[PDB]
Design an enzyme around this catalytic site. Structure first.
Site, PDB file in Angstrom:
ATOM      1  N   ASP A  36       0.954  -1.218  -0.068  1.00 25.15           N
ATOM      2  CA  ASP A  36      -0.176   0.042  -0.112  1.00 25.15           C
ATOM      3  C   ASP A  36       0.884   1.175   0.071  1.00 25.15           C
ATOM      4  O   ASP A  36       2.128   1.211   0.440  1.00 25.15           O
ATOM      5  CB  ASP A  36      -1.134  -0.058   1.404  1.00 25.15           C
ATOM      6  N   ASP A  92      -7.379  -2.520   2.829  1.00 26.46           N
ATOM      7  CA  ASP A  92      -6.542  -3.303   2.765  1.00 26.46           C
ATOM      8  C   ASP A  92      -6.919  -4.773   3.385  1.00 26.46           C
ATOM      9  O   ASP A  92      -6.328  -5.821   2.890  1.00 26.46           O
ATOM     10  CB  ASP A  92      -5.245  -2.895   3.429  1.00 26.46           C
ATOM     11  N   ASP A 106      -2.375  -0.805   6.190  1.00 28.90           N
ATOM     12  CA  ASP A 106      -2.616  -0.264   7.399  1.00 28.90           C
ATOM     13  C   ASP A 106      -4.211   0.160   7.563  1.00 28.90           C
ATOM     14  O   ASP A 106      -4.674   0.322   8.418  1.00 28.90           O
ATOM     15  CB  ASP A 106      -1.932   1.052   7.808  1.00 28.90           C
TER      16      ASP A 106
HETATM   17  F1  ALF Z   1      -2.734   3.856  -0.476  1.00 29.34           F
HETATM   18 AL1  ALF Z   1      -4.077   3.160   0.532  1.00 29.34          AL
HETATM   19  F2  ALF Z   1      -5.599   2.433   1.540  1.00 29.34           F
HETATM   20  F3  ALF Z   1      -3.368   3.782   1.930  1.00 29.34           F
HETATM   21  F4  ALF Z   1      -4.598   2.228  -1.038  1.00 29.34           F
HETATM   22 MG   LIG Z   2      -2.786   3.164   3.880  1.00 34.31          MG
END
Ligand code: ALF
Ligand SMILES: [Mg+2]
Ligand SMILES: C/C=C(/C)C(=O)O[C@H]1C(C)=C2[C@H]([C@@H]1OC(=O)CCCCCCC)[C@@](C)(OC(C)=O)C[C@H](OC(=O)CCC)[C@@]1(O)[C@H]2OC(=O)[C@@]1(C)O
Length: 994
Positions: A351, A707, A703
């Protein structure tokens, strides 16, 4: 209503036939509540007290081992009056062992936090609706909400269901959709329909999704979907069924158990093929009521000899110690089998926000006007150090530490950032870190002003609590913020009306400080700030400014650029209509340009180096973010996923772009592309799934709540320490220090642990091979029971159970992270090693039997009984003239069985030394490297002597303490197994591969 975003405001009201003004009738609520159900995610706790025990015996080798226990139990009643001292111990022991291994696993699996329960924390208890009952707004339970309800939401509220926005009561409706996108940035909503029926959540700017919270504003809408029909419901649905697939090592053990059942159910039958010559002669001394028991006494003897018991205790022990070892490396392991799997990781799906970055908006670049002369226009560009919200950093002019107070342009720039700002900064005393209060893109301005310190306010002596808003408060003491013209969609800008401190209301000196999108703001500027002076906005000047914003907006940097301008002579306080936003742009005209700030969510300092280590390890990293592609590609270049100037036209796709591709080209894109942006939670899990179709052990790091489906689907789910609870509960590991470099050390351990596991797996199995051969001989040759199915148990629990765990502390390779990830289908025993451990098993099987047969033919305290009459141990009390020699009760004596056991034990103590390496001789590689292995051995030896001397122990094992005459013979048979393998090691490294 499916796809309510595609239909207009009036079309959604018609779908339910509900009045926006009155709401649903109590009759309409009754029917809808029965049709669509309650607005609530179904709770799920699959682990019960009973079902957790049932799954323990679901293992194939457990079933086989269980049956023997049953068989052991049945064959315990029939006993004479001279050997009836012990009969039920073997079955009892088997049962106890079965329960113990099963019981321990439950305690190390039942302790699991339910991820769905954590997800339901994003479900509000109360909801606000309008119905035909009362004219006023009713506050009811959120679960009592049905599709068609006219729901009202306000600032601070948590959205109960997926709602099509009817009317926005406030000027703007800002919405935090971090549970679906992973971004905390406020989303400005509207009521206009979104034609695209395949639009993603980031595109659905007329919808309010359940679980999300209202950042700012008041709005009214109609419920589209409830329960699992919501976007958060799709997240719930993907977190069910088989949550975790079996590890590649478990698949190897399952493959072992299947083929083991094919052998035992063939060897027993193979023995049946041999026992034919005795059935020929008409003998009624042993009918079918007794002659069939011989096959059940060898079946349970082959069962405990084949099944590698004790191994579930060795693995569990090794994995428990590995966890604590990784715990000191700031790596919390929630799933023990995931440790072995992480070492085989070839692809890491990651992520962006909060994982690869700090999730803390920071202004890194800013420029003001230097000098103007005709077609010439120079700027004063600055760089700002700092990747957090903390007031720690300096301002750099050409990479020099220059105070911002000197530049009058920076003084006015800091003034705008402080005043035109609805957010603040706070220092959490508990966490000991600075946190934002409000908009992230606004707290960045708060942090900037603190770093700049344009008035040189002494702040190095202030407490961290007082330091947070020190420099900002100084500016507030200068200008009194009368009111703020809130953000508008037709402006893409925001201004605040300020009067000089300690001045009259009808005085002259008031100012408007504007902040917004560079395009709209600059176009509404007619002047330019040069320090404290003012010059007209000309062609060349405007073009130069727009050129730099173009550079900072797109490229290797790609920054969120904000233009800053002031209205030197604003309208009178009384001639400004504040209840009409359409007139705000006219108020924000005739502005004077001051400067431009550039901000971005900065990558962590330990990410780029970590990815390189992954690349060196043969592991690729893929970014899957809900953020836009522009910043996604930029960050990828900043951390080394993409080249500084690499063409990534076919190596980066959005969520919508990915959905347009056919299933064949989607699966291929996952192997080609390395950047996926603006994606839904379901997209991340689909990418992982596609990668798992190439038989790649894939990991997932994140996080956010969005996710969770990918964290669960991946073989190894990794959550950030300062992340959501949903992410942690759906992950296998948790990075406490929030370091991406921790994963590198975790993989290093995962490869090192498996290599040690790759040894005692071979050690215990090779021991079992020698045991099967031992039983196979005595059953199909005629010899009595050399090793009973009771002694083997203690061998495969204490005798071998200790050196196996001792091999878990073997020194790992130095080039363990310079080698590409091993194949998930890589066999443990194959090729030369398949033949090597085949000869050892044949040696142990032979050696063992020979030892028990040595106490007969060439004995010292045993009756000379040659091979011609030793095989017929059954015919003694029923056939005397042809056989007598000595006593009749000699074949089932506790003397020859101890000789075989003493050899078996001593061999495995030697075999443990050979298991120190795959193809390295003990002469070359010192056996005294692992001090723990010597120790396991010594302890076991004593135990092997403890089981002899202490009288209540060989009573159940049928043993006898060997003298100097019998022991010494053991060393002369067990020891030459060292030289046996030693040659095999030499051949494999001089004729194959060392
Ligand atoms: F980059 Al993200 F949930 F923090 F897709
Ligand atoms: Mg994130
Ligand atoms: C322990 C008792 C033995 C007899 C047994 O049944 O294991 C076999 C079998 C199940 C395999 C074999 C065993 O096969 C034999 O040894 C042939 C026996 C013929 C003897 C008869 C001659 C008179 C393993 C043991 O052979 C030796 C030579 O090492 C290796 C390996 O096992 C592993 O790598 C360990 C996995 C836990 C497996 O081929 C495995 O099957 C596959 O699924 C694997 C991948 O498991």
């Amino acid at each position: 209503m499916e796809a309510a975003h595609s239909k207009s405001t009036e079309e959604c009201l018609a779908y339910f036939g509900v009045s926006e003004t009155t709401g649903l009738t109590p009759d309409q609520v009754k029917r809808h509540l029965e049709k669509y159900g309650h607005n609530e995610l179904p709770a799920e706790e699959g682990k019960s007290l009973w079902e957790l025990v049932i799954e323990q015996f679901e293992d194939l080798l457990v079933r086989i081992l269980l049956l023997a226990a049953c068989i052991s139990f049945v064959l315990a009643w029939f006993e004479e009056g001279e050997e009836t001292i012990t009969a039920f111990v073997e079955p009892f022991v088997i049962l106890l062992i079965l329960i113990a291994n099963a019981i321990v696993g439950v305690w190390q699996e039942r302790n699991a936090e339910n991820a769905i329960e954590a997800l339901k924390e994003y479900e509000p208890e109360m909801g606000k609706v309008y119905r035909a009952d009362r004219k006023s707004v009713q506050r009811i339970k959120a679960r009592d909400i049905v599709p068609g309800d006219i729901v009202e939401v306000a600032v601070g509220d948590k959205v109960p269901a997926d709602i099509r926005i009817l009317s926005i009561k406030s000027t703007t409706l800002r919405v935090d959709q971090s549970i679906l996108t992973g971004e905390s940035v406020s989303v400005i909503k509207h009521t206009e329909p979104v034609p695209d029926p395949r639009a993603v959540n980031q595109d659905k700017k007329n919808m309010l999704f359940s679980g999300t919270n209202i950042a700012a504003g008041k709005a009214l809408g109609i419920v589209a979907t409830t329960g699992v029909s919501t976007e958060i419901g799709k997240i719930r649905d993907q977190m069910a069924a088989t949550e975790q697939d079996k590890t590649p090592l478990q698949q190897k053990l399952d493959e072992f158990g299947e083929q083991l059942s094919k052998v035992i159910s063939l060897i027993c039958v193979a023995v049946w093929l041999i026992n034919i010559g005795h059935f020929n002669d008409p003998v009624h001394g042993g009918s079918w009521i007794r002659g069939a028991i011989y096959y059940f006494k060898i079946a349970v003897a082959l069962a405990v000899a084949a099944i590698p018991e004790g191994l579930p205790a060795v693995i569990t022990t090794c994995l428990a110690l590995g966890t604590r070892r990784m715990a000191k490396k700031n790596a919390i392991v929630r799933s023990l089998p995931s440790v072995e799997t992480l070492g085989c990781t070839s692809v890491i799906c990651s992520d962006k926000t909060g994982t690869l970055t700090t999730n803390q908006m920071s202004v890194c670049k800013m420029f003001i006007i230097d000098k103007v002369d005709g077609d010439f226009c120079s700027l004063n560009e600055f760089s700002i150090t700092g990747s957090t919200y903390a007031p720690e950093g300096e301002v750099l002019k050409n990479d020099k530490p220059i105070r911002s107070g000197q530049f009058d342009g920076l003084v006015e720039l800091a003034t705008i950032c402080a005043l035109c700002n609805d957010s603040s900064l706070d220092f959490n005393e508990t966490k000991g870190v600075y946190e934002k209060v409000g908009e992230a893109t606004e707290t960045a301005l708060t942090t900037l002003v603190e770093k700049m310190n344009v008035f040189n306010t002494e702040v190095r002596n202030l407490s961290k609590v007082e330091r947070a808003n020190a420099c900002n408060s100084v500016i507030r003491q200068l200008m009194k913020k009368e009111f703020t013209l809130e953000f508008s969609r037709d402006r893409k800008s925001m201004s605040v009306y300020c009067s000089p401190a300690k001045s009259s209301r009808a005085a002259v000196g008031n100012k408007m400080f504007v902040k917004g999108a560079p395009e709209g703001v600059i176009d509404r500027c007619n002047y330019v700030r040069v320090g404290t002076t003012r010059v007209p906005m000309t062609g060349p000047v405007k073009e130069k400014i727009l050129s730099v914003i173009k550079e900072w907006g797109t490229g290797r940097d790609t920054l969120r650029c904000l233009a800053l301008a002031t209205r030197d002579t604003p309208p009178k306080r009384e001639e400004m209509v504040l209840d009409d936003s359409s007139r705000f742009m006219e108020y924000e005209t005739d502005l004077t340009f001051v400067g431009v700030v550039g901000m971005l969510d900065p990558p962590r300092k330990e990410v780029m180096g970590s990815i390189q280590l992954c690349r060196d390890a043969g592991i690729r990293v893929i970014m899957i973010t809900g953020d836009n592609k522009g910043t996604a590609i930029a960050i990828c270049r900043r951390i080394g996923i993409f080249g500084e100037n690499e063409e990534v036209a076919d190596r980066a796709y959005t969520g919508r772009e990915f959905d347009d591709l056919p299933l064949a080209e989607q699966r291929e894109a996952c192997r080609r592309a390395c950047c996926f942006a603006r994606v839904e939670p379901s997209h991340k899990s689909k990418i992982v799934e596609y990668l798992q179709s190439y038989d790649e052990i894939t990991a997932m790091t994140g996080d956010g709540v969005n996710d969770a489906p990918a964290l669960k689907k991946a073989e190894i789910g990794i959550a950030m320490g300062s992340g959501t609870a949903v992410a942690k509960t759906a992950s296998e590991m948790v990075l406490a220090d929030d370091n991406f470099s921790t994963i590198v050390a975790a993989v290093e351990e995962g490869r090192a642990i498996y290599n040690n596991m790759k040894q005692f797996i071979r050690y215990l199995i090779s021991s079992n091979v020698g045991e099967v051969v031992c039983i196979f001989l005595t059953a199909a040759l005629g010899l009595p029971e050399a090793l009973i199915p009771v002694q083997l148990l203690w061998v495969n629990l204490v005798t071998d159970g200790l050196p196996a765990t001792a091999l878990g502390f073997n020194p790992p390779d130095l080039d363990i992270m310079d080698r590409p990830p091993r194949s998930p289908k890589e066999p443990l025993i194959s090729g030369w090693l398949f033949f090597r451990y085949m000869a050892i098993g044949g040696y142990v099987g032979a050696a063992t039997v020979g030892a028990a047969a040595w106490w007969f033919m060439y004995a010292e305290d045993g009756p000379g009984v040659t091979y011609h009459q030793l095989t017929h141990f059954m015919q003694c009390t029923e056939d005397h003239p042809h056989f007598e020699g000595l006593d009749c009760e000699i074949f089932e004596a506790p003397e020859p069985m101890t000789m075989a056991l003493s050899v078996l034990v001593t061999i495995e103590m030697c075999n443990a030394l050979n298991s120190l390496s795959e193809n390295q001789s003990l002469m070359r590689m010192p056996p005294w490297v692992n001090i723990w292995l010597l120790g396991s051995i010594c302890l076991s030896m004593s135990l092997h002597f403890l089981i002899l001397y202490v009288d209540p122990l060989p009573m159940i094992f049928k043993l006898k303490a060997l003298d100097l005459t019998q022991w010494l013979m053991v060393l002369k048979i067990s020891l030459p197994v060292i030289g046996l393998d030693e040659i095999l090691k030499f051949i494999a490294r001089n004729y194959l591969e060392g």
